[PDB]
Design a protein around this ligand. Structure first.
Ligand SMILES: NC[C@@H]1O[C@H](O[C@H]2[C@@H](O)[C@H](O[C@@H]3[C@@H](O)[C@H](N)C[C@H](N)[C@H]3O[C@H]3O[C@H](CO)[C@@H](O)[C@H](O)[C@H]3N)O[C@@H]2CO)[C@H](N)[C@@H](O)[C@@H]1O
Ligand SMILES: NC[C@@H]1O[C@H](O[C@H]2[C@@H](O)[C@H](O[C@@H]3[C@@H](O)[C@H](N)C[C@H](N)[C@H]3O[C@H]3O[C@H](CO)[C@@H](O)[C@H](O)[C@H]3N)O[C@@H]2CO)[C@H](N)[C@@H](O)[C@@H]1O
Ligand SMILES: NC[C@@H]1O[C@H](O[C@H]2[C@@H](O)[C@H](O[C@@H]3[C@@H](O)[C@H](N)C[C@H](N)[C@H]3O[C@H]3O[C@H](CO)[C@@H](O)[C@H](O)[C@H]3N)O[C@@H]2CO)[C@H](N)[C@@H](O)[C@@H]1O
Ligand SMILES: [Mg+2]
Ligand SMILES: [Mg+2]
Ligand SMILES: [Mg+2]
Ligand SMILES: [Mg+2]
Ligand SMILES: [Mg+2]
Ligand SMILES: [Mg+2]
Ligand SMILES: [Mg+2]
Ligand SMILES: [Mg+2]
Ligand SMILES: [Mg+2]
Ligand SMILES: [Mg+2]
Ligand SMILES: [Mg+2]
Ligand SMILES: [Mg+2]
Ligand SMILES: [Mg+2]
Ligand SMILES: [Mg+2]
Ligand SMILES: [Mg+2]
Ligand SMILES: [Mg+2]
Ligand SMILES: [Mg+2]
Ligand SMILES: [Mg+2]
Ligand SMILES: [Mg+2]
Ligand SMILES: [Mg+2]
Ligand SMILES: [Mg+2]
Ligand SMILES: [Mg+2]
Ligand SMILES: [Mg+2]
Ligand SMILES: [Mg+2]
Ligand SMILES: [Mg+2]
Ligand SMILES: [Mg+2]
Ligand SMILES: [Mg+2]
Ligand SMILES: [Mg+2]
Ligand SMILES: [Mg+2]
Ligand SMILES: [Mg+2]
Ligand SMILES: [Mg+2]
Ligand SMILES: [Mg+2]
Ligand SMILES: [Mg+2]
Ligand SMILES: [Mg+2]
Ligand SMILES: [Mg+2]
Ligand SMILES: [Mg+2]
Ligand SMILES: [Mg+2]
Ligand SMILES: [Mg+2]
Ligand SMILES: [Mg+2]
Ligand SMILES: [Mg+2]
Ligand SMILES: [Mg+2]
Ligand SMILES: [Mg+2]
Ligand SMILES: [Mg+2]
Ligand SMILES: [Mg+2]
Ligand SMILES: [Mg+2]
Ligand SMILES: [Mg+2]
Ligand SMILES: [Mg+2]
Ligand SMILES: [Mg+2]
Ligand SMILES: [Mg+2]
Ligand SMILES: [Mg+2]
Ligand SMILES: [Mg+2]
Ligand SMILES: [Mg+2]
Ligand SMILES: [Mg+2]
Ligand SMILES: [Mg+2]
Ligand SMILES: [Mg+2]
Ligand SMILES: [Mg+2]
Ligand SMILES: [Mg+2]
Ligand SMILES: [Mg+2]
Ligand SMILES: [Mg+2]
Ligand SMILES: [Mg+2]
Ligand SMILES: [Mg+2]
Ligand SMILES: [Mg+2]
Ligand SMILES: [Mg+2]
Ligand SMILES: [Mg+2]
Ligand SMILES: [Mg+2]
Ligand SMILES: [Mg+2]
Ligand SMILES: [Mg+2]
Ligand SMILES: [Mg+2]
Ligand SMILES: [Mg+2]
Ligand SMILES: [Mg+2]
Ligand SMILES: [Mg+2]
Ligand SMILES: [Mg+2]
Ligand SMILES: [Mg+2]
Ligand SMILES: [Mg+2]
Ligand SMILES: [Mg+2]
Ligand SMILES: [Mg+2]
Ligand SMILES: [Mg+2]
Ligand SMILES: [Mg+2]
Ligand SMILES: [Mg+2]
Ligand SMILES: [Mg+2]
Ligand SMILES: [Mg+2]
Ligand SMILES: [Mg+2]
Ligand SMILES: [Mg+2]
Ligand SMILES: [Mg+2]
Ligand SMILES: [Mg+2]
Ligand SMILES: [Mg+2]
Ligand SMILES: [Mg+2]
Ligand SMILES: [Mg+2]
Ligand SMILES: [Mg+2]
Ligand SMILES: [Mg+2]
Ligand SMILES: [Mg+2]
Ligand SMILES: [Mg+2]
Ligand SMILES: [Mg+2]
Ligand SMILES: [Mg+2]
Ligand SMILES: [Mg+2]
Ligand SMILES: [Mg+2]
Ligand SMILES: [Mg+2]
Ligand SMILES: [Mg+2]
Ligand SMILES: [Mg+2]
Ligand SMILES: [Mg+2]
Ligand SMILES: [Mg+2]
Lengths: 260, 188, 185
RNA sequence: GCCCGUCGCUAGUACCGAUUGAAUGGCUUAGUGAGGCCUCAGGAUCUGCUUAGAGCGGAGAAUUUGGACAAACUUGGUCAUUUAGAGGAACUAAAAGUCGUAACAAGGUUUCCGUAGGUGAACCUGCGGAAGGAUCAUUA
RNA sequence: ACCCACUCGGCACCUUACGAGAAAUCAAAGUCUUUGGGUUCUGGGGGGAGUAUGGUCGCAAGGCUGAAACUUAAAGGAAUUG
RNA sequence: GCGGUAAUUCCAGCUCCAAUAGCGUAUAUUAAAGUUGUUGCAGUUAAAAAGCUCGUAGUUGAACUUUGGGCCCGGUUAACGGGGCCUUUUUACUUUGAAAAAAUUAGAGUGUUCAAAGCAGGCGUAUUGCUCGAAUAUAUUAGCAUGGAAUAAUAGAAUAGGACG
RNA sequence: UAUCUGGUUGAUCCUGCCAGUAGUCAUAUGCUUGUCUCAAAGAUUAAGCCAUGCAUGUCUAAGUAUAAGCAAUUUAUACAGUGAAACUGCGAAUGGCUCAUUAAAUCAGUUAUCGUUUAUUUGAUAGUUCCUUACAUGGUAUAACUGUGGUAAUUCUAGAGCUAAUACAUGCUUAAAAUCUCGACCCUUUGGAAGAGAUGUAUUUAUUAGAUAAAAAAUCAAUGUCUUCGGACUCUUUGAUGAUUCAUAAUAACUUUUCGAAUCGCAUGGCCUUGUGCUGGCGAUGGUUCAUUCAAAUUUCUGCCCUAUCAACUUUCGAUGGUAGGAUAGUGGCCUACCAUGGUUUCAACGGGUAACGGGGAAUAAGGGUUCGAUUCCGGAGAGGGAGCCUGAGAAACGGCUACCACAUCCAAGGAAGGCAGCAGGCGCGCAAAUUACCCAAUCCUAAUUCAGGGAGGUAGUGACAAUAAAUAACGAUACAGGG
RNA sequence: CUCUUAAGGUAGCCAAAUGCCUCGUCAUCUAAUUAGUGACGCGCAUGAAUGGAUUAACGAGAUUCCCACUGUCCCUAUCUA
């Protein structure tokens, strides 16, 4: 249709932004990012619709243009900038930090981590190849390309990544019984460990999973993110820790802490 | 402009389909530049997404490779002789791929005699050092040598002159040399 | 391209319109509740039918079905909370037996009459729609307001008007002021 | 009693129809063919390299060779959808006209079928059916 | 050749309704709201009408295929009493 | 069907019914309609079995191949369910899943005063505050992965050009 | 949310339709019309025609200011605050509208790119440029501007003279190796050796590696070390894929040789032989390849309504396939050349109709279904009809150009300009649908960019489309009838 | 029903090479048509081997129109024997 599409319509936006039907015809349309705007958080959504710090469209700009926000160590000027999975978002004048991690319903959760643990990030290595001159390279989910990596790292690992500089502080391989966060799907936002990886030649390997409460379920290998060693993530998970409590179970817990 | 679309065609059942939409640039095609021998003239085409194709218009003198020797020198490209698609290109002496042209043999003769030391097809003590080692590999072919007597060699254009702008190829050897020989003599 | 604001119609009108008996039963219900139009009888029989049909396809599900568990018990808990299903009749079988007078009984009109405050269903409504029957702090003038079981005890005259509080009506406050020049100067 | 057809008047729909009937669109053979694009050229003007003055290079307007694309005009055909028509010939409505009374009673020549010919009209006659017949019946 | 008993396969017939059907009736026209063994063909109020048109077959008479506009509350079946 | 002189039917008066900020009319479409019939029609006489037989397509097509016995482990309200031992040991289909846009439908939650909606909200000390949400399930064709082996198909040694070491 | 009734008769049971009943996010119309919430609305007839206005423009400290521009009084004598114009930059390919085409087409769900393109965004990537004479930074050219002008007339322009750059055209620059060739002279053995080139990246071709699964001795050319006249042989370099001629590296060349920073803003620090020497901070804009992101292009499987009064169709002149080429961003009969005779069909081709854009969905509410979808979202197509194209990363664009056809405006008769299926609004059409309003405050988008611009959008008018709520009266008194 | 004289124009066709009236009337063709064609038919005086109706093909037969063509014409000029 003649070129790039510069608009997004409300009701066409990602559901996990939790926008309201009325109030406008349009969503922000995240910028061209490290993350696919399908799965991503525009800064305006985070600040205005989650942190509830900004009340306006014009107000979100007054924050960024006041130099306040950074992301993954670097200041981010862009209103629609698509902060994705495993990001940082430091605000000095508010002293806080947030690592973006999914709910157990699958939305980006508003999750505060301390002045450390916002040092480093994890990312899933999407490909590892040979660059110019023979220089090997590796790139994460968020499009970080890191050069001269560890010969052990293959696709479908994770990498612990210093921010202020870069490169690679150790890593975690992919084999039986590792800690895993589910990137997207029916089971998106869950956490668990590897019961088996069903191999499929010519695409779409099934990855079997078991969580802390001993439930089984499967998703796509491409959505299987290794978050660390079994029972010990490398980052801080929020309440419920991606446990997928049943809808029936939910009702009780709401009417449990509800009383006197 | 010309259209590369498959929907101006007929369905494999044979039916003629109505025109569904207009012509769009990305399905276009453009005119052949039929490149013939002559003083180098090469036109630029602004391709898809910017970049450049290079139209070969008049092409003399482009790079050729002697396979077994592992060496490549530049020569004149006299004209065409054979061509599998259209003799019209032979007659008109147009340069495309699969061309089977004829090239200046002399820069290809010079390298040999200044390497293997034997003159082709009939002091500096450091040199006789080298020519001593390189011998016993010094027989080429009866069919590849004889053309040096004439001064022009049988070569096949492997570039796409209207595309790259270079007209390049490789001298014919082996049975491939024989195949086009049994053509030239038993055709013309 | 505005977001498509949705809606629905609240009532279902009867198939056979002229049935000689049903006409009477409705007329009574209009009087023995104090209803404006036959639509306020329709609104409830439609509510009841979707309530019934909900339980209808719910009992089709062999027991210990989460749908018959979670949903079926999310109905009862809503159905008792308003005083329709009695404090315990609670079952999926006892909602199917639940009739039309049960919702109508719980209306703010059919309550404001019930305990004091009215002594008519026609006085009730006229009281409701005019300002003051208010429940709690907030005035609610809807004769259909559907009093919940425990919201009952909070319903009395409103903080304004001659019945519950400051000032009398300006019918009378105009009467006291027209003797001001008659019995005064 | 019911009841058929012609004939006679009143209104309505469609049909056939001389007009080589009109109209709109699509696909089209032929002929012609704008325009930009590619290409062979051209060279108003302006202009750099090596050496008044001469040799070799770049920039470039009108104009132009050839080529593909190709609107569109003319003339034909084809398909679609719509439509005018003197006259023709039906059918349908409205009722207690005219002619006779074909069918319903063995309806007064049982009715009906296919076919064939004939007759103002329903109908009549030939052959071969059927029974939905007016006979379930002559081991007597 | 005749008699008798048995048994297939025939053209029918009789009684009973086990059933079925609007009934007349039906050993199928039964095994049908306890609705499915397989399969072929047709019908969808009465007219208009087997008309018009196209196609096709025939020497022709004709056959095969086969509409719509419009019109109408009945038409019809079986049985009952007159 | 009413009206041709005492009109239950027209024009009205009176009253009465019906639904009511809405009731009527035209047109379409759905239900009624088992009057399109897979479920689920009808065809002697009401509409309707080709004059008759052949026969391609299509639909459809008898039965038979592991039956039975003996123990075990772990499941959910002795009935039943799931997973293994021993006994001479190719599809069509069906389940589970994944990957399925949001709206919309269904549906949980919540006092928009009710509600249609909305996805807000709720408690507070109301002097630089706490905080649970935004559930859940869906066209069942195709594709992908998976458990199932009944049913129905399909291949296999007939001049052995068969199997096996 | 599993219902029926009325009508064929003298009466009867059937068949059977007509009629009644109810619903419609379904349209019109009539009569009536008070209150809150909510808010469809020229789709249908004619993608018919349209006067006028509006709808696309855009600057930060950070490209270009000598405005005969404003402004204080500038340490500001190169500039410096502000800042019109114009240059360079980017956008104008998004939106918004409409449903005319379109029946295997679009489209849906589902694959493919080991078959390509990609502004931007994010993440990395560059010591190599001259060769035998700026690096304290080469060269001109121009707009705005001023001034002389033409035409009835336009977002027309002529020629005269100035002046800028991240415009245009140019062009130096830096480590240590190491491997290659070629090779003056020394001259014997198992013999060697200065110093003359070549090596960034990209383009083009050719060739090479990109390998392994289990172990042992014999062969030839010349070496590849090495020790002490005895000759020893110690060692094979892969990253990835289901899969590659993949990534990546190697040699020989090739090239009207791609990029390799003559670029701006804030700062003003540190050294010492003090020359305005040498060295330095965070930024902005760029730039080569790679990945990423926003996309694009094609693509696998399966799925469309009526029609046989459409049964054969495709193949001139591409129909199906093979080869080669050409063209493309790239695959492919996309096109050309040669060659074969293929390809579809009663499991319905081909053809015709559609008052047909597909889908998400909508109406109906036993089940099984019937009917509808111009229309808020997604995809597609189009901008009167057709075609062609320039710029560009992206267009076969129309609020871009060029032509034709059909419209149609101005004119001074010479010529000139146009495309409401954007927002309003006019005529027309019909049964059929609203104001030539306000506004960037909200949602958001665009830009050099917090500021500006947005008939996207929002507000308001019109608005009995549809939906929700649900006033038009309430309680006694007195006077008669009536219930224990 | 009548009537003279045996019957009393059937199937068909038509202003026809048959129609007086007559350049019949209607439609069509044309700017205009005593022409042509299609109709209509109480047809002065069509009509059945005195053959009636139809009819493919054929024709130096009669007739109308169309396209092409042209000095037939507008309107005449020139050339050769
Ligand atoms: N809109 C009028 C014209 O439509 C033309 O386009 C026409 C065609 O694209 C298309 O016509 C189709 C045709 O393709 C196809 N092969 C046959 C089909 N019957 C035609 O259909 C057309 O005409 C029929 C009547 O014949 C109508 O019933 C129908 O609505 C119409 N679409 O439909 C359009 C007609 O509406 C041109 N765009 C242009 O000349 C003009 O705009
Ligand atoms: N809205 C986001 C999503 O869009 C989807 O849209 C569909 C299409 O856009 C997409 O189609 C293909 C895709 O399969 C494939 N993997 C990539 C391809 N580029 C896509 O196709 C694309 O290009 C084609 C050809 O030019 C266009 O016709 C098409 O409109 C465009 N989307 O595949 C999607 C699923 O079939 C779906 N509607 C849905 O999953 C979801 O709404
Ligand atoms: N003009 C014919 C039209 O036919 C239409 O429909 C006709 C046919 O389509 C329909 O079916 C006929 C059937 O009657 C006839 N007796 C047998 C024939 N096979 C069927 O034919 C139909 O179906 C077959 C497949 O069975 C198709 O192959 C055929 O193309 C189709 N016409 O029955 C109708 C004929 O009775 C409509 N009746 C109407 O539009 C009109 O009558
Ligand atoms: Mg955005
Ligand atoms: Mg997608
Ligand atoms: Mg083409
Ligand atoms: Mg008539
Ligand atoms: Mg042509
Ligand atoms: Mg031309
Ligand atoms: Mg007529
Ligand atoms: Mg006639
Ligand atoms: Mg008589
Ligand atoms: Mg009579
Ligand atoms: Mg009689
Ligand atoms: Mg008699
Ligand atoms: Mg008689
Ligand atoms: Mg008699
Ligand atoms: Mg008789
Ligand atoms: Mg009889
Ligand atoms: Mg007779
Ligand atoms: Mg007669
Ligand atoms: Mg009969
Ligand atoms: Mg049933
Ligand atoms: Mg019928
Ligand atoms: Mg017939
Ligand atoms: Mg016929
Ligand atoms: Mg009878
Ligand atoms: Mg009276
Ligand atoms: Mg009445
Ligand atoms: Mg009356
Ligand atoms: Mg039905
Ligand atoms: Mg079934
Ligand atoms: Mg029936
Ligand atoms: Mg019958
Ligand atoms: Mg037959
Ligand atoms: Mg809902
Ligand atoms: Mg079987
Ligand atoms: Mg009858
Ligand atoms: Mg009806
Ligand atoms: Mg319109
Ligand atoms: Mg509209
Ligand atoms: Mg658009
Ligand atoms: Mg079509
Ligand atoms: Mg798709
Ligand atoms: Mg110059
Ligand atoms: Mg100039
Ligand atoms: Mg000048
Ligand atoms: Mg390679
Ligand atoms: Mg940057
Ligand atoms: Mg053939
Ligand atoms: Mg062509
Ligand atoms: Mg080929
Ligand atoms: Mg090829
Ligand atoms: Mg290609
Ligand atoms: Mg052929
Ligand atoms: Mg259409
Ligand atoms: Mg449709
Ligand atoms: Mg649509
Ligand atoms: Mg329903
Ligand atoms: Mg249903
Ligand atoms: Mg039903
Ligand atoms: Mg339409
Ligand atoms: Mg429509
Ligand atoms: Mg759209
Ligand atoms: Mg228009
Ligand atoms: Mg540019
Ligand atoms: Mg377009
Ligand atoms: Mg546009
Ligand atoms: Mg255009
Ligand atoms: Mg416009
Ligand atoms: Mg003038
Ligand atoms: Mg408008
Ligand atoms: Mg009007
Ligand atoms: Mg309206
Ligand atoms: Mg409307
Ligand atoms: Mg705004
Ligand atoms: Mg603004
Ligand atoms: Mg400013
Ligand atoms: Mg309304
Ligand atoms: Mg009033
Ligand atoms: Mg006569
Ligand atoms: Mg006579
Ligand atoms: Mg006679
Ligand atoms: Mg006769
Ligand atoms: Mg005559
Ligand atoms: Mg005459
Ligand atoms: Mg004649
Ligand atoms: Mg005559
Ligand atoms: Mg004449
Ligand atoms: Mg005449
Ligand atoms: Mg005549
Ligand atoms: Mg006559
Ligand atoms: Mg006569
Ligand atoms: Mg006369
Ligand atoms: Mg005579
Ligand atoms: Mg005679
Ligand atoms: Mg005679
Ligand atoms: Mg005669
Ligand atoms: Mg004759
Ligand atoms: Mg002739
Ligand atoms: Mg003749
Ligand atoms: Mg003749
Ligand atoms: Mg003649
Ligand atoms: Mg002449």
């Amino acid at each position: 249709a003649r070129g790039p599409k510069k608009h997004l319509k409300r009701l066409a936006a990602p559901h996990h932004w939790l926008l309201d039907k009325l109030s406008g015809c349009y969503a922000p349309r995240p910028s061209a990012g490290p993350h696919k705007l399908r799965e991503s958080l525009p800064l305006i959504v985070f600040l205005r619709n989650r942190l509830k710090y900004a009340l306006n469209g014009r107000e979100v700009k007054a924050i960024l243009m006041q130099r306040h926000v950074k992301v993954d160590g670097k200041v981010r000027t862009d209103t629609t900038y698509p902060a994705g999975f495993m990001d940082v978002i430091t605000l000095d004048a508010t002293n806080e930090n947030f690592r973006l991690v999914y709910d157990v319903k699958g939305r980006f959760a508003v999750h505060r981590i301390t002045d450390e643990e916002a040092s480093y990030k994890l990312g899933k290595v999407k490909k590892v190849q040979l660059g110019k001159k023979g220089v090997p390279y590796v790139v994460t989910h968020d499009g970080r390309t890191i050069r001269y990596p560890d010969p052990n790292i293959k696709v479908n690992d994770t990498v612990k990544i210093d921010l202020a500089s870069g490169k690679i502080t150790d890593f975690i391989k992919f084999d039986a019984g590792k800690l895993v966060y589910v990137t997207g799907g029916r089971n998106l936002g869950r956490i668990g460990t590897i019961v088996h990886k069903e191999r499929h030649d010519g695409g779409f390997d099934l990855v079997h999973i078991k969580d802390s409460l001993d439930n089984t379920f499967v998703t796509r290998l491409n959505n299987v993110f290794v978050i660390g060693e079994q029972g010990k993530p490398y980052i801080s998970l929020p309440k419920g820790k991606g446990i997928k409590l049943s809808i029936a179970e939910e009702r009780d817990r709401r009417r449990a802490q509800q009383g006197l | 402009g010309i259209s590369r679309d498959s929907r101006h065609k007929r369905s494999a059942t044979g039916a003629k389909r109505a025109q569904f939409r207009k012509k769009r640039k990305f399905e276009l095609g453009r005119q052949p530049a039929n490149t013939k021998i002559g003083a180098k003239r090469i036109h630029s085409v602004r391709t898809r997404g910017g970049n450049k194709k290079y139209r070969a218009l008049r092409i003399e003198t482009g790079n050729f490779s002697w396979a077994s020797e592992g060496i490549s020198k530049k020569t004149r490209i006299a004209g065409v002789v054979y061509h599998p698609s259209n003799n019209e290109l032979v007659r008109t002496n147009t340069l495309t791929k699969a061309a089977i042209v004829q090239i200046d043999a002399t820069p290809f003769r010079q390298w040999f005699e200044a390497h293997y030391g034997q003159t082709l097809g009939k002091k500096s003590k450091n040199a006789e050092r080298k020519w001593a080692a390189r011998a016993a590999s010094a027989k080429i072919e009866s069919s590849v040598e004889s053309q040096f007597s004439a001064g022009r060699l049988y070569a096949c254009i492997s570039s796409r002159p209207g595309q790259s702008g270079r007209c390049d190829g490789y001298i014919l050897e082996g049975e491939e040399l024989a195949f086009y020989l049994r053509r030239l003599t038993a055709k013309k | 391209p505005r977001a498509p604001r949705t809606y629905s119609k609240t009532y279902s009108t009867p198939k056979r319109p002229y049935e000689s008996s049903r006409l009477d039963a409705e007329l009574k219900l209009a009087g023995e509740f104090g209803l404006k139009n036959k639509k306020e009888i329709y609104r409830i029989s439609f509510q009841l039918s979707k309530i019934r049909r909900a339980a209808r396809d719910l009992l089709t599900r062999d027991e210990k079905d989460p749908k018959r568990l979670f949903e079926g018990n999310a109905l009862i808990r809503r159905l008792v909370r308003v005083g329709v299903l009695s404090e315990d009749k609670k079952k999926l079988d006892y909602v199917l037996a639940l009739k039309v007078e049960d919702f109508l009984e719980r209306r703010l009109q059919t309550q404001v009459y019930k305990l004091g405050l009215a002594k008519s269903v026609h006085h009730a409504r006229v009281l409701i729609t005019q300002r003051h029957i208010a429940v709690g702090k907030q005035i609610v003038n809807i004769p259909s307001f559907m009093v919940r079981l425990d919201s009952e005890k909070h319903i009395d005259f409103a903080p304004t008007s001659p019945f519950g509080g400051a000032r009398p009506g300006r019918v009378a406050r105009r009467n006291a002021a027209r003797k001001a020049e008659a019995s005064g100067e």
